[PDB]
mmCIF file of C-alpha atoms and ligand atoms in Angstrom:
data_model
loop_
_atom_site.group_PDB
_atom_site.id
_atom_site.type_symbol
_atom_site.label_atom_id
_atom_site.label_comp_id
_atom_site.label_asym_id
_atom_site.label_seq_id
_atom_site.Cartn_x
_atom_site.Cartn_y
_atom_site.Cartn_z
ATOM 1 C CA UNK A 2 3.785 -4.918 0.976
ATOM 2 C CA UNK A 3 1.462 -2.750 -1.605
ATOM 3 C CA UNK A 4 -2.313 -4.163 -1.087
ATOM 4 C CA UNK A 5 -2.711 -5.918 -4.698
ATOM 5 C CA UNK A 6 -4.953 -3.995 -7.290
ATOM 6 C CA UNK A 7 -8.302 -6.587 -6.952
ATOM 7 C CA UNK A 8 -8.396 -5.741 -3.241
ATOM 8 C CA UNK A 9 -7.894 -1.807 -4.550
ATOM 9 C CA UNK A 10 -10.460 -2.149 -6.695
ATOM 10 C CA UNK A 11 -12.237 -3.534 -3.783
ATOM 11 C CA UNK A 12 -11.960 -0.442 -1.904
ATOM 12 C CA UNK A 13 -13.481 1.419 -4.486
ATOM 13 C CA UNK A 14 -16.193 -0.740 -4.884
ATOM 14 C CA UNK A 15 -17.150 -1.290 -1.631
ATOM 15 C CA UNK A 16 -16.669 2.791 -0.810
ATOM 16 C CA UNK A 17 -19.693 2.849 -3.633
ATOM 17 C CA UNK A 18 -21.737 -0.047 -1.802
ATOM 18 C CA UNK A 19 -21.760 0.958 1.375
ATOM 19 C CA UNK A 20 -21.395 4.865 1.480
ATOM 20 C CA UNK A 21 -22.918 5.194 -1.642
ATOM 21 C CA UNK A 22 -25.939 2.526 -2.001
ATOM 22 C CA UNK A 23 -26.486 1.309 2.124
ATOM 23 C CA UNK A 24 -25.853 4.526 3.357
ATOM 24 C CA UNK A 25 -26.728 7.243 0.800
ATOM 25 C CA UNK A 26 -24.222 9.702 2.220
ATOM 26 C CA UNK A 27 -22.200 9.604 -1.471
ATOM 27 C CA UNK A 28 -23.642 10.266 -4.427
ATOM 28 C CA UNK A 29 -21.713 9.380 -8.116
ATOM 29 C CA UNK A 30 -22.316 10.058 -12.072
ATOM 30 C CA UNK A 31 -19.628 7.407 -12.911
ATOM 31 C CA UNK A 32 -18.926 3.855 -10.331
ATOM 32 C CA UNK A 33 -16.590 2.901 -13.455
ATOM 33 C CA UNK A 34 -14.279 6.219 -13.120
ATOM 34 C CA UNK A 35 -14.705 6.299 -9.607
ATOM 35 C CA UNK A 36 -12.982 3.151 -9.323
ATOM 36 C CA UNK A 37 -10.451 3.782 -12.268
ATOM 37 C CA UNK A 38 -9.412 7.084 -10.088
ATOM 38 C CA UNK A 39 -9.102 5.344 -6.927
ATOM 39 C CA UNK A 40 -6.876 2.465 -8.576
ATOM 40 C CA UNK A 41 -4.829 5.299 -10.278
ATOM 41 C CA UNK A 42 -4.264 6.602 -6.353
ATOM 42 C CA UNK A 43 -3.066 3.629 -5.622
ATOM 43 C CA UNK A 44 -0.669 3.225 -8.302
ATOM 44 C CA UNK A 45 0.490 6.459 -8.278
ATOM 45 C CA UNK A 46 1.471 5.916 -4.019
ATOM 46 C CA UNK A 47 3.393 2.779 -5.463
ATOM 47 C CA UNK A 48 5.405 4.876 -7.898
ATOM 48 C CA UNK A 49 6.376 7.279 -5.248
ATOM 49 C CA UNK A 50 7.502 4.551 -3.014
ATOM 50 C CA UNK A 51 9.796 2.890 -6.189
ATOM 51 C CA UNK A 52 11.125 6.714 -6.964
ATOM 52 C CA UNK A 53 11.735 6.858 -2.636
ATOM 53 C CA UNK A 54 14.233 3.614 -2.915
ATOM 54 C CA UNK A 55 15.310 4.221 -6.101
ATOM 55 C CA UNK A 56 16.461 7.713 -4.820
ATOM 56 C CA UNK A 57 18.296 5.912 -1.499
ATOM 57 C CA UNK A 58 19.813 3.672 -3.653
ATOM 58 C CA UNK A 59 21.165 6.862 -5.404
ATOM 59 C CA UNK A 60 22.256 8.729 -2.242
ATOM 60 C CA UNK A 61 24.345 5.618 -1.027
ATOM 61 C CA UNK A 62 26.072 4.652 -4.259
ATOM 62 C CA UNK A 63 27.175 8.513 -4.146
ATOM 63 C CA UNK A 64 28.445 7.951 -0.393
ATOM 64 C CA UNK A 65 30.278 4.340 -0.543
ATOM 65 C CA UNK A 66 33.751 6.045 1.338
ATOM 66 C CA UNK A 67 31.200 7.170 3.984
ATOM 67 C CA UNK A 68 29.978 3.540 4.764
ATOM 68 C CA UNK A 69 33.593 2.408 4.941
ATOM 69 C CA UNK A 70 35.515 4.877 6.663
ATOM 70 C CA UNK A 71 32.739 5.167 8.800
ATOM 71 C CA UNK A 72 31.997 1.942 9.432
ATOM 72 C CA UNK A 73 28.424 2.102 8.865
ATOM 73 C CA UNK A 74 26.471 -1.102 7.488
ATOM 74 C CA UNK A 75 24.935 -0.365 4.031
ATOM 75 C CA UNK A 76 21.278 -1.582 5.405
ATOM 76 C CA UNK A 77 21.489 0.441 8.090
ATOM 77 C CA UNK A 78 22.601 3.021 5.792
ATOM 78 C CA UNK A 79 20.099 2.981 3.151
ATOM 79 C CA UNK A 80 17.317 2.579 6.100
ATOM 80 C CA UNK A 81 18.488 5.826 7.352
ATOM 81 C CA UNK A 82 18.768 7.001 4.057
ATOM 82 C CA UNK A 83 15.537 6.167 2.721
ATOM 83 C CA UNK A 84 13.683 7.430 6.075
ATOM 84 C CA UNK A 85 15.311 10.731 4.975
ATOM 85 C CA UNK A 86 14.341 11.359 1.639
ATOM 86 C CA UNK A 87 10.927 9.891 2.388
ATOM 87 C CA UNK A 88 10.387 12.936 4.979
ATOM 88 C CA UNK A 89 11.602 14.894 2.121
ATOM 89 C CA UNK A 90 9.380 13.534 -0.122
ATOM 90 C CA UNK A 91 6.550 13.630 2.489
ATOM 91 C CA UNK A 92 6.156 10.130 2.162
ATOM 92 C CA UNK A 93 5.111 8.398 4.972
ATOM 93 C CA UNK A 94 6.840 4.658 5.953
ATOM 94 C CA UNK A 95 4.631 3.045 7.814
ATOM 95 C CA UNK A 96 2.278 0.804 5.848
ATOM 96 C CA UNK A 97 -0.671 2.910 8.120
ATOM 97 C CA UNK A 98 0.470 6.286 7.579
ATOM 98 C CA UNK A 99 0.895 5.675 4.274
ATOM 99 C CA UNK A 100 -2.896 4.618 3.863
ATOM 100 C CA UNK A 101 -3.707 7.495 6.141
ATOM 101 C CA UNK A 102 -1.907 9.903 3.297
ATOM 102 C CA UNK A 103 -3.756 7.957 0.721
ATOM 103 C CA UNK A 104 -7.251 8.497 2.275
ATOM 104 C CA UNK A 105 -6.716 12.087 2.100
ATOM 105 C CA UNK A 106 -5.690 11.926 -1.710
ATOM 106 C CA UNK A 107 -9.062 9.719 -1.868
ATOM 107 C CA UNK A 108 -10.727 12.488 -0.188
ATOM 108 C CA UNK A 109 -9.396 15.516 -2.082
ATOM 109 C CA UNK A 110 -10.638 13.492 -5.329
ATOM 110 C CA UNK A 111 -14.007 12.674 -3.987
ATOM 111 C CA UNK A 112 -14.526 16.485 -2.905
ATOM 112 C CA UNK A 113 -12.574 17.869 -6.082
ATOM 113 C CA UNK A 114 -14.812 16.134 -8.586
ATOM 114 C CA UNK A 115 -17.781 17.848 -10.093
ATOM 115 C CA UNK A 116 -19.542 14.367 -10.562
ATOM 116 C CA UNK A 117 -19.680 13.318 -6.537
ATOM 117 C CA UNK A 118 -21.700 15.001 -4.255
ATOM 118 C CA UNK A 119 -21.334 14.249 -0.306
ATOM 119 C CA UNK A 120 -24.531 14.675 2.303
ATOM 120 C CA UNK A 121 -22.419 14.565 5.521
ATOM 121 C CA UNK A 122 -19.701 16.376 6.961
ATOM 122 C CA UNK A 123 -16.518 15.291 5.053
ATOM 123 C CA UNK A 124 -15.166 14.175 7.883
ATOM 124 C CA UNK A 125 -17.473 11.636 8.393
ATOM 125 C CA UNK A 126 -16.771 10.468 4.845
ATOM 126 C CA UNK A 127 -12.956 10.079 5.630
ATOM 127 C CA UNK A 128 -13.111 7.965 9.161
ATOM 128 C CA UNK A 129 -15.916 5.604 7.087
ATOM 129 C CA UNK A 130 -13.684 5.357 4.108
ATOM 130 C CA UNK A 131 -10.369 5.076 6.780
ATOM 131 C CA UNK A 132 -12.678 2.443 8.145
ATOM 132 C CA UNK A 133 -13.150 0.452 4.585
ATOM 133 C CA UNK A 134 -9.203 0.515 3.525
ATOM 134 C CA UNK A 135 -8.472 -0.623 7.187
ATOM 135 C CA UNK A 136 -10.435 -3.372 6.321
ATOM 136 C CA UNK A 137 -8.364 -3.915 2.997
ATOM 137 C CA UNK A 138 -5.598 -4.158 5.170
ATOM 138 C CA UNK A 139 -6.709 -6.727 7.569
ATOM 139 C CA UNK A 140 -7.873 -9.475 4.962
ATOM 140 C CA UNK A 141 -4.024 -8.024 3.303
ATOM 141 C CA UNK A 142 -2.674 -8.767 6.991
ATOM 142 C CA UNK A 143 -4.816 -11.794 7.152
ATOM 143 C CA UNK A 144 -3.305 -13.230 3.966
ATOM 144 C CA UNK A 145 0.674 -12.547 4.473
ATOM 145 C CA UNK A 146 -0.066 -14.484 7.481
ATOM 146 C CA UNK A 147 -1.368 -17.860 5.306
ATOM 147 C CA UNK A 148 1.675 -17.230 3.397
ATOM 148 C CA UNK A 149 4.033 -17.138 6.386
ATOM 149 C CA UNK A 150 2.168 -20.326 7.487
ATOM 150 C CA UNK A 151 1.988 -22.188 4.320
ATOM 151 C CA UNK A 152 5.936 -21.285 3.537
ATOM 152 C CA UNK A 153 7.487 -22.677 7.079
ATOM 153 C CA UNK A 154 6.448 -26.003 5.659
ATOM 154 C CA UNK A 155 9.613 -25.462 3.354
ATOM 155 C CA UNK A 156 12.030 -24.292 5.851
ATOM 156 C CA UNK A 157 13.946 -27.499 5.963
ATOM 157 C CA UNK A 158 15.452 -27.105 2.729
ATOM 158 C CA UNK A 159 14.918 -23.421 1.452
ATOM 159 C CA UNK A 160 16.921 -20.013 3.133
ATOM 160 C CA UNK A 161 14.161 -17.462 4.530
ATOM 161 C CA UNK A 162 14.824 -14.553 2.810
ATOM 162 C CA UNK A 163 16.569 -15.938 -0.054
ATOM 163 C CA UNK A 164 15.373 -14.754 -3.569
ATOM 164 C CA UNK A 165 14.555 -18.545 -4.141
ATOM 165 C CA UNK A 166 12.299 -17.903 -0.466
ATOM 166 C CA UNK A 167 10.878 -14.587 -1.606
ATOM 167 C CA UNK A 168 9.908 -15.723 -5.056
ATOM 168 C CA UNK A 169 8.062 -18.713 -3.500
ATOM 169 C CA UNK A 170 6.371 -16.204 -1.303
ATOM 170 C CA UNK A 171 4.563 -14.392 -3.995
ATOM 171 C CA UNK A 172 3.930 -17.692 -5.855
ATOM 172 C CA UNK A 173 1.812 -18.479 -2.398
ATOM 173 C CA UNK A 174 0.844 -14.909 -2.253
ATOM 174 C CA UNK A 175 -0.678 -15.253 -5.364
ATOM 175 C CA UNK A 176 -2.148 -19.092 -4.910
ATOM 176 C CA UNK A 177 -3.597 -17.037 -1.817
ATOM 177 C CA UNK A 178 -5.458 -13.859 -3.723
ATOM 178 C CA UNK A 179 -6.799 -16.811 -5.883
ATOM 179 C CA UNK A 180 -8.237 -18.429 -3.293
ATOM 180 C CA UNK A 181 -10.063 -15.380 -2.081
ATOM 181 C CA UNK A 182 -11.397 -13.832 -5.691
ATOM 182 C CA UNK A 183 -8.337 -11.299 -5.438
ATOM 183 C CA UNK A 184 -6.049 -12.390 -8.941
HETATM 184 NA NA1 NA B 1 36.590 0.227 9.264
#
């Protein structure tokens, strides 16, 4: 689960508060750009992970007789599969990882553009920023587990993991993000 583009824009926002305006370590020409490149960092990680399945898909339709003859189960297949590629692609799967990749690409834009200055040790500026999109990912952690909650209530007469169950999930989801400011 991608974190949702209000609690991106979050991120960037709150990168600007605190670094920038509580802390003075990060200094910025442009909050609006700032945050439009951050977003696009975030979209752009989504894209690679649609290209990553879309490419396992690929791999597997190519390799059908394999699964058969074989006798190896198409989602443990395209599991494998996709774990492949994705160190390929150096793409990293866990949800954690993959933030940890994206703080870097947050960090080469901060120290590649000519309108930010920094006034610590870039280092610093990565564990605090690490420290703000971990953050992100707890109120992200905090709300799949709402949904989770809130959906049980229909497990009497719904399949979990049905599209009918998933689709209901992001209608929560999305009742949830409401409820905190985030859609
Ligand atoms: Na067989």
């Amino acid at each position: 689960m991608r974190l949702p583009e209000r609690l991106v824009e979050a991120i960037a926002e709150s990168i600007i508060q605190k670094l920038g305006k509580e802390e003075g370590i990060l200094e910025l020409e442009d909050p609006a750009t700032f945050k439009k490149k951050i977003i696009s960092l975030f979209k752009e990680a989504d894209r690679e992970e649609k290209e990553l399945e879309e490419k396992a898909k690929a791999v597997l339709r190519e390799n059908l007789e394999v699964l058969e003859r074989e006798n190896i189960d198409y989602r443990t297949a395209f599991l494998a599969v996709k774990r492949k590629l994705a160190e390929e692609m150096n793409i990293n799967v866990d949800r954690r990882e993959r933030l940890n990749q994206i703080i870097n690409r947050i960090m080469d834009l901060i120290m590649k553009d000519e309108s930010v200055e920094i006034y610590e040790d870039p280092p610093v500026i990565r564990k605090k920023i690490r420290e703000i999109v971990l953050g992100a990912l707890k109120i992200e952690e905090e709300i799949e587990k709402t949904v989770r909650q809130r959906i049980k209530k229909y497990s009497r007469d719904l399949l979990e993991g049905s599209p009918e169950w998933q689709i209901l999930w992001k209608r929560i989801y999305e009742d949830e993000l409401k409820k905190r400011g985030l859609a």
